Amino acid sequence: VQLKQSGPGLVKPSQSLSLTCSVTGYSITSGFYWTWIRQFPGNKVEWMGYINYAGNNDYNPSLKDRISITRDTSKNQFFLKLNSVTSEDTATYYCTRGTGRIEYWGQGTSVTVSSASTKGPSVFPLAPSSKSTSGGTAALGCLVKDYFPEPVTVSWNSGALTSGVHTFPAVLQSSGLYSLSSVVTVPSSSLGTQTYICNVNHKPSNTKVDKKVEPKSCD
C-alpha cells in the first residue's frame, strides 16, 4: 500500500489546517485505522486520531474539539482538519495505516503556523576554484537564501548527481527568512568538461530555479 500526502505547508494562526492522504494498493473500507500522527520540532511524536474502515473516529483528547478526520471512499482518500491552530501545531504531519502498531507511513508534510508571508528563494552559486580544491577534489554548491516557509528541495543535474552531495539543514536568519547551502565534491579534473546545475524547488511559493554553477579563477 502507498500513502501520498498533500496540502498546504503554511497556515495562519487561528485558521484551519487541512491535509489529504491518497491511498493506493488497498481500499480504506477493507480494514485498518487510517491515522494521523505528527512529530514536533524536538522529536516528540503525538497520535492525533483515526477514521476506521467503517467511517468511525477516535481522537486524542489533547485535540479537544479542534480535530476532524473524514474520508472520500470513491477517491480512497482520508483527510485531516485541525481548527484554531497556533505555533503549537507546527510539526511534520504523517498519514499512516495502523492496526495498533503502525506499519505504513506517508512521506510527511511540514506544516508551519505563522502570520509571515510566503517568499521564494534566491539562488547564488558557490563557485569551485583553487580556494575550494583539495588534492584532486573540488567542492561547489548553491546558496539558497531568503525563503519562507520550509521546506525546499535541492537536486543536482536533475538527480543524476547524488554522490558527495551535502544539503545542509536550513537556518532561520535574523530577518525571519530561511537560508541553506547544498554542496557537492567532484573530481577537479571534471570542472572543465562536466556541467553542474542545482535544481531548487520551493513548493510553498511555486518557485523552481535551475542554477548553473561554473568555475572561477582565484589568484
Partner 1 sequence: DIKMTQSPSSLAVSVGEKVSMSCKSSQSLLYSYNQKNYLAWYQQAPGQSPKLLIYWASTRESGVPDRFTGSGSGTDFTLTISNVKTEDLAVYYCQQYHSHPLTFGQGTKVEIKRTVAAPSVFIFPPSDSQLKSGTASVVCLLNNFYPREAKVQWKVDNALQSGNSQESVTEQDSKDSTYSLSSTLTLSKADYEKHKVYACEVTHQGLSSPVTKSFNRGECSRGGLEVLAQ
The site for partner 1 (CB under 8 A) is made up of 43-47, 58, 60-62, 94, 100-103, 105-108, 122, 124-127, 129, 131-134, 137, 139, 141, 143, 145, 166, 168-171, 173, 179-181, 183, 185, 214-219
CB of 161 to partner 1, least distance (A): 16
CB of 53 to partner 1, least distance (A): 17
Closer of 39 and 114 to partner 1 (Cβ): 39
CB of 75 to partner 1, least distance (A): 23
CB of 18 to partner 1, least distance (A): 20
CB contact burial 73-100 (16+ within 10 A = b; e otherwise): eeebbbbbebbebeeebbbbbbbbbbee
Give the start-end residues of each E strand in 40-161: 45-52, 57-59, 67-72, 77-82, 91-99, 101-105, 109-113, 122-126, 133-134, 137-147, 153-156
Work out whether the CA dihedral 12, 16, 22, 26 comes out positive or negative: positive
CB of 47 to partner 1, least distance (A): 4
Q: Which residues contact 19 (CB under 8 A, 6 or more apart)?
A: 5, 6, 7, 36, 79, 80, 93, 95, 109, 111
d(CA 59, CA 63): 7
Closer of 17 and 184 to partner 1 (Cβ): 184
Closer of 12 and 166 to partner 1 (Cβ): 166
Closer of 160 and 171 to partner 1 (Cβ): 171
Closer of 72 and 214 to partner 1 (Cβ): 214
Closer of 49 and 204 to partner 1 (Cβ): 49
CB of 10 to partner 1, least distance (A): 21
d(CA 51, CA 117): 33
Separation in Å, CA 149 to CA 40, 52, 138, 209: 16, 33, 32, 17
